[PDB]
Write a protein that binds this ligand. Structure first.
Ligand code: SJ5
Ligand code: SJ5
Lengths: 596, 589
C-alpha cells in the first residue's frame, strides 16, 4: 500500500485532529459536480452528520433511497505547528467509493466502502489557515467491486441500488474522519507473530518505515514496564513469564516502535497487542494450544438512525449483551467493521472472524435481481469476474494489513455465500486465499461462509479453508414450521455426508436463525414467533452436538438489522436474538444458558 | 462567572482537542475514592463511552440504577506548543455535580448537570506530555439543587434516586469534552442585541476580555464579506440592507471580535449570529415586528442506549421530523440542551424557549415521592437556581434561535413565598440577558388563575394542561373540554393582555394500539384529544402558541404509570410518526 493503515495516535511526533461533526452535503443526481466546480465548495448543501449513514435522516423516499454520486464538504483549521509534517486526511471509510479533494485539488480515490482511505494532502495543505475538504462519493452496486449488486435506472432516470446481499445499502461517511500529521520519516506498518515457549513467549516482528534510519522496538507490560527490547526492522522480542491474551480474559502489552538517528528520536508508534497463538489441529481450533469452542454471533454495523454510523455507545452496549450471553466470538458479517470494534474486542478478550465484503456473489440472486424487470438472457461474467477478483484481493490486502495485529482477530473470512461448485470458482478463490496468506504475517486460519448450494458433493472450494463455516437454515428457509422434523432429518443427512468425507477439519456454523417478531407469541409456536425461535435453536443445537467436528456456533444475527424493503423483510431482518435497540427476545436466554 | 461560556473554536490564537472516546469509569458505592487516591487514577475501572449517559449500557439493575458517587478518567497528550496558553478542560456538562482533577490536583467543582464546566488547568498542565483528568461525579437528587428530588437508601446501603420529575435520572458525561488553549489575554464574553431600522439594522454589542488592550469588532455576511466594523468593547455595528434571521428562513452573519496590540492581534473570537428582534406586544409574540404563532414541541435529550448522550445524528433526524410537521419552535424541556442543538436551530430558523432545570418544585409530587418553598433549604435552592440561570443565559444569549427563557416547569406558585422566590429568579435573569428577551415559565394546573401569584412576573404565560388525559379522560372527554374552557374563560376574564402559549398537552399513546371507538392509550385517542385541544386553543384570541408534549417517547423512572417511559410522544423514541403526527403536520401547514 502507498499509505499506512496504522490507527492514528497523538504524541510528540504525530498529531491528529477530528473532523467529525456536521458536514455540508449535496446529492448530485445529474452528475454535474466536477464540471461545475463542486470540488471548490458545494453550491446548495444541507447539513450531514459525520460519522453516520445518510439515509435514515430524511423524511422522503427519494433522499433515503438515493443512489449515485453525492458530495460532502467541511473546513478545518490546520495548526501552524504542523508545517514540517506529512499531513494526511484519514477517513475510517468512504462508502462505497470516492475521490478526495483538498483545497480544490484532487488527492486520491478509493474503491471499497469499509476500510480506511488515506489522502496525502502535504502538498496542498495550508498550515495556520482554514483548509477545505470535499469528497465525491458514489454508492452504486456492480459486479466488479464489493459488495456486489446492480443499479437499476427507473423510468425517470432515477437510480436505485439493487443489492445481491441481505442488508440495506447504507452509505456516506460512516466512520470518523481525522486530519493527521506524521514525521517525514515514519513507521508505516509493522507485523507481530507469536510463539509460546513454556512460561515464556517470543514476539517476532517486522517494521516498515518510510526511511533508512535505525529502528528500536520495545515491549511494555500492562503497567508500562519494559519487558523486552531489541533493534532492527526485523527481530524477536523475548518475553519471560509472558501473560498470555486469553479468551474472555485479555492481557495487552504495548509495542513501542522508535525510529532514531542516534542523536534523537524521529518517530514513535505505539499500539496495544496481545500474546496469543491460533492454529487448527485436526478438528480443533487451538487458542494458546488449548481447544476453544466458538460461541457467539454474526453482527452488523447497524443501529437506529445512525445506520452503520460508528458510535462507542453501540460498542459498549453490544459487548455488555455479548458478555451477558456468555459469548466469546463474533464474525464481522459482512465487511470489516470500524477499527474501534477490534480495539474493544482486544480489551474484552473476544475472538473475531474478520470478514472481507465478498458477499453477493451467488448466481441465483444475481439472476433474480435481473429478472425482476427485466432480463433473463444477458449476463457477462467472463468479463467482470477478473475485475471483481482484483477488487476482492485489494480489499483483502487492506483488511489484513489494517487488522493483523489485533489479538482478537483469529481468522479471516474471505467470502459469504458465493458460488463454489465450479473449477472456475476454485481458481478464483485460490488467488484470494494465496493473497491473504501473503499479506498475513501470522498466516492465521482462513475460511469463508458457505451457503447450502455448496453441497458436499459439489463444492470445489472448501479444501482451501483451514476450517469450514456453514450458513444453514434447516427449519427456516428449508422445511420450516410444521416441517421442522423433516428439517432436522435433512440437516442430519447433510452433516452425515460431511462426516463421511472425514475431512479432519473443524466446522463452525456461522449462521442459523429464524425471523422473529418481538412480542409475537403462539402456543403451539409458529414461524416468526418468539417460541419458534427457541424451538428452532434447540433443534439446531441437537444437530450440532451430534458431530465431533463441529467446534463453533455463531447465530444469525446478534440483532435485528436494516435490509432493503420487500415482501420478505418486515422492517429489515428480524433474525436478531436481540432487537435493534439491543434488548433480548426469549431466545437470548437460551443462548445464555447453553453457553454458560 | 470566573470562566468563559464561549463555545470553543480553533484558529491562530485558540486551540482545541477532543477528549471524547472510551474513558475509564468506576462506581464508588462506599464513597472512598477521594480517601483512596482515585484522583490519581481509578483502581479497577471499566470502559465508558463519552459522550453518553452510563445507565443503559449495563445488563444488571444495580449498575443501571446506580445512584451516588462515580468516577471517570482519561489521559491525553498535550501538544508542546500549548505552553504558556491558558489551558482549560471544557466539559459540555457533568451530570449532576462533580469535581474535576487534573494530574492529581483538584481544579474545580460544579453543581448543575446541564451546562458547561470549565476547569483551568494552566498551572498543572504538562505540555508535550501525557496528562490525566479524573472526575468525581454524583447523581443524587435533593431539594437544594436542580432538578429536584430525593435519594432513598435501601436497607443494604444502596442509594436510589427518587425524582420529583417525570424523566429518568440519566447521568455521567453526557456531552463532549475538550481540552482547549486560549491566549493569556482573551475574549471571555460578548453580548449582542438588535434594532431594526427600516431596511437597515443595528447590532449593539458589549465585549468582556481578560485584559486592557483595544478591541475591534467586525461583522461578516454569510459569504464572509465585511459589512460593518467598529472599535471598542462597547459599540454599535451598522448594517445596511440587513438580511434578517427569519422563522424557518435563517440568515447568519459572523461576528468577529479581535483584541489588538497595535501592530498585531492577540485573540480572535468568531461566532455566527442572526439579526432578529423578539418582543411581546399585547397578546402577540412579535418576531421582527410581525406576529408569530408558535408551533412545535417540548423535547428531551433522549435516545435509545445513549440516553441523553449528544449526537449530531439525533439533531439531524429530529430537525427533519420537526420540519416535516411544519413546526417552528421547541422548548428545551426541562434543562438546557447541548449547545449544538441551538447552533442547529440557528441554521434552520427554529425558535427556542430555553429552559433552566427548575423542575420538581412541587409539593404534591414532592410529598408523595418523599409547602415546597417554605422549607429551610429554599434559600440554598434559590442560589442554585439563580446560578444555573446565569450560566444558561450567559451561554445561550447570542443564539438568534433563543427567543425566550423558561425559568421553571411546574413549581408551586400559589403562595407569597413562591412569588418572593421567583421574583429573585426573574430579577437575576433580567440582569444577565443583554437583550431582555421574554421570560416565562410553564405552569401546572395547580396554579389556578385565582391562586397563582407568579404569572405577573412573566412576559407571556405558558400553560401545561392535560384536560382529556389526567383530568376527565376517555369517556369523560366532553367534560374535559368544558373544564378546559371554564379555566380559559377565567384567564380571559382577567384581561391580562398577554399571550398564552400551551407548552404541554398530550396523551400516552402506544404505537400500534388501535381501537374503534378509541380508548385512552390508543393512536386514535391521541388524535381525538389533540383535535379537542385545538378547538379550545382556537377559541381564545390570546392563545399564540402550542407546543405538544412530547416530540418523542422518552425514558422515565419505572413505575405503574409508565410503560417503558413516557409515551406522549408524537413520534416514537426511534423517531417515527404515530397517527397524530399527521394531524399536527396538516394543522401547522
Ligand atoms: O437470509 C438471511 O437472514 C441471511 C442469509 N445469509 C446471509 C445473510 O446476510 C442473510 O441476512
Ligand atoms: O405527565 C407528563 O407526561 C408530563 C407532565 N408535565 C411535566 C412533564 O415533564 C411530564 O412528562
Amino acid at each position: 500500500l502507498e499509505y499506512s493503515e496504522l490507527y492514528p495516535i497523538q504524541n510528540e511526533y504525530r498529531m491528529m485532529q477530528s473532523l467529525d461533526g456536521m458536514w455540508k452535503f449535496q446529492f448530485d443526481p445529474e452528475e454535474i459536480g466536477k464540471k461545475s466546480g463542486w470540488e471548490n465548495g458545494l453550491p446548495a448543501p444541507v447539513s450531514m452528520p459525520v460519522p453516520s449513514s445518510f439515509a435514515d435522516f430524511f423524511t422522503d423516499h427519494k433522499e433515503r433511497d438515493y443512489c449515485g454520486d453525492f458530495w460532502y464538504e467541511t473546513e478545518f483549521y490546520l495548526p501552524a505547528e504542523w508545517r514540517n509534517k506529512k499531513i494526511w486526511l484519514r477517513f475510517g471509510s468512504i462508502t462505497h467509493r470516492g475521490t478526495v479533494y483538498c483545497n480544490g485539488m484532487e488527492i486520491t480515490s478509493h474503491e471499497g466502502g469499509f476500510l480506511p482511505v488515506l489522502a496525502d494532502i502535504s502538498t496542498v495543505a495550508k498550515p495556520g489557515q482554514v483548509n477545505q475538504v470535499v469528497v465525491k462519493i458514489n454508492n452504486e452496486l456492480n459486479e466488479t467491486s464489493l459488495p456486489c449488486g446492480a443499479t437499476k435506472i427507473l423510468n425517470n432516470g432515477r437510480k436505485l441500488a439493487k443489492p445481491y446481499f441481505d442488508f440495506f445499502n447504507y452509505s456516506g461517511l460512516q466512520r470518523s474522519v481525522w486530519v493527521i500529521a506524521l514525521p517525514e520519516e515514519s513507521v508505516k506498518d509493522y507485523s507481530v507473530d507469536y510463539e509460546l515457549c513454556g512460561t515464556d513467549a517470543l514476539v517476532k516482528y517486522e517494521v516498515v518505515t518510510t526511511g533508512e534510519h535505525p529502528v528500536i522496538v520495545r515491549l511494555l507490560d500492562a503497567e508500562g514496564e519494559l519487558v523486552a527490547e531489541t533493534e532492527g526492522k526485523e527481530g524477536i522480542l523475548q518475553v519471560a513469564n509472558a501473560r498470555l491474551w486469553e479468551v474472555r480474559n485479555a492481557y495487552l502489552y504495548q509495542i513501542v516502535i522508535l525510529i532514531t538517528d542516534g542523536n534523537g528520536v524521529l518517530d514513535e508508534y505505539r499500539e496495544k497487542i496481545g500474546i496469543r497463538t491460533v492454529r487448527i489441529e485436526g478438528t480443533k481450533i487451538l487458542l494458546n494450544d488449548r481447544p476453544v469452542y466458538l460461541k457467539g454471533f454474526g453482527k452488523h454495523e447497524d443501529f437506529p438512525i445512525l445506520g452503520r454510523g460508528f458510535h462507542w455507545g453501540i460498542v459498549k452496549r453490544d459487548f455488555e449483551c455479548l458478555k451477558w450471553t456468555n459469548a466469546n466470538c463474533f464474525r464481522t458479517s459482512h465487511y470489516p467493521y470500524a477499527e474501534e470494534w477490534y480495539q474493544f474486542a482486544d480489551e474484552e478478550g473476544f475472538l473475531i472472524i474478520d470478514e472481507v465484503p465478498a458477499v453477493g456473489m451467488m448466481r441465483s440472486t444475481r439472476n433474480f435481481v435481473a429478472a425482476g424487470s427485466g432480463n433473463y438472457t444477458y449476463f457477462f461474467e467472463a468479463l467482470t469476474v477478473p475485475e471483481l477478483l482484483k477488487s476482492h484481493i485489494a480489499d483483502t490486502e487492506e483488511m489484513i494489513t489494517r487488522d493483523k495485529n489485533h489479538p482478537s482477530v483469529i481468522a479471516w473470512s474471505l467470502f459469504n455465500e458465493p458460488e463454489t461448485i465450479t473449477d472456475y470458482a476454485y481458481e478464483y478463490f485460490k488467488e484470494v486465499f494465496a493473497a491473504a496468506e501473503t499479506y498475513d504475517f501470522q498466516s492465521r486460519p482462513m475460511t469463508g461462509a458457505f451457503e447450502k448450494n455448496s453441497k458436499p458433493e459439489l463444492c470445489k472450494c472448501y479444501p482451501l479453508c483451514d476450517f469450514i463455516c456453514l450458513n444453514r437454515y434447516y427449519g427456516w428457509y428449508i422445511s420450516g414450521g410444521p416441517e421442522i422434523e423433516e428439517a432436522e432429518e435433512l440437516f442430519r443427512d447433510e452433516m452425515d455426508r460431511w462426516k463421511a468425507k472425514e475431512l479432519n477439519v473443524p466446522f463452525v456454523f456461522t449462521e442459523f436463525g429464524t425471523d422473529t417478531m418481538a412480542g409475537l407469541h403462539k402456543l403451539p409456536s409458529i414461524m416468526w414467533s418468539e417460541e419458534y425461535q427457541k424451538e428452532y435453536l434447540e433443534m439446531n443445537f441437537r444437530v450440532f452436538d451430534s458431530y465431533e467436528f463441529v467446534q463453533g456456533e455463531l447465530a444469525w444475527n446478534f440483532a435485528d438489522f436494516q435490509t432493503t424493503e420487500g415482501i420478505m423483510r418486515v422492517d429489515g431482518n428480524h433474525k436478531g436474538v436481540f432487537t435493534r435497540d439491543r434488548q433480548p427476545k426469549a431466545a437470548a436466554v437460551v443462548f445464555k444458558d447453553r453457553w454458560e
